[PDB]
Design a protein around this nucleic acid. Structure first.
Length: 220
RNA sequence: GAAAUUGUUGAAAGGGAAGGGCAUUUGAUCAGACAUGGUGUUUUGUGCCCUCUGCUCCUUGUGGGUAGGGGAAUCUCGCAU
């Protein structure tokens, strides 16, 4: 498998396992189904960052773990009012599991490696984000993708998600929004989600007041 | 080879009590640095220094160890005078 090669204790078989995962992601004929296989892939990539300690190789590794949303379903096919055709259909299963992995992991990360996963989740939100598609508009990708962002990670009507990751997404999605390079994009519907969180009672004050200051106070 | 206790020697005290506490003098006596620089300039001379050529352990850059020559006319980078 790849969960034993990405979670190895050897550096060389983890780099070679990443390159065989590059060939495995450009071998698109086998990644057709089975959500939990993608969940296991993101758990192996989670450990594959977890063994990297030095700052320059962990930034190279975060950049290429973001780039794995780019090799897997590159934009070139560039579908026309084509709903979800083998570059956008399976991609969403590669996104959700990542957030699911972080939804499983936010207790179990210590005070010295948590910067790696703040920076990692910065790069990965920027990269899915960059692959809405090559352009920032694909409409059923926007509402289906925003349903498979809304329905898991900024739920904020469920306490099952850990409250540090939506406030970190609030801290990063503006600068990493405008890393895409004043234009008009489906941003506001995204912001409507946060307005839903301000509309949602039966929550804690932090989500309610920290997005209500941090996200809405931005003049951009 | 402890104390009680005994002798000798030395010191001290003693007009019908000593030993104790607070404080001090006198007499006797013991402590009391193989401490020695620090800083800023200037001769030189070396090296892990500059430069030429390398070799080797491993993990991510912000690596480590270790040879052969040359060169101070630049360099305090360090250490010696």
């Amino acid at each position: 498998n790849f969960v034993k090669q990405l979670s190895s204790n050897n550096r060389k078989t983890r780099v070679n396992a990443l390159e065989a995962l590059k060939k495995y992601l450009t071998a698109k004929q086998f990644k057709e189904n089975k959500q939990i296989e993608f969940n296991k892939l993101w758990k192996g990539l989670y450990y594959a960052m977890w063994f990297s300690d030095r700052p320059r190789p962990q930034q190279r590794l975060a950049n290429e773990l973001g780039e794995l949303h780019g090799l897997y379903f590159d934009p070139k096919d560039n579908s026309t009012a084509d709903e979800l055709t083998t570059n956008d259909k399976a991609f969403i299963k590669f996104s959700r599991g990542f957030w699911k992995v972080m939804c499983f992991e936010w207790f179990n990360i210590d005070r010295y490696r948590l910067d790696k996963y703040l920076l990692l989740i910065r790069r990965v939100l920027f990269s899915q984000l960059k692959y809405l598609q090559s352009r920032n508009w694909d409409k059923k990708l926007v509402d289906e993708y925003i349903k498979k962002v809304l329905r898991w990670l900024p739920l904020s009507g469920s306490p099952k998600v850990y409250t540090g990751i939506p406030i970190h997404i609030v801290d990063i999605l503006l600068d990493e929004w405008e890393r895409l390079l004043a234009k008009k994009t489906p941003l506001a519907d995204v912001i409507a989600i946060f307005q839903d969180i301000v509309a949602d009672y039966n929550n804690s004050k932090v989500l309610r007041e920290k997005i209500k200051e941090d996200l809405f106070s931005d003049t951009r």
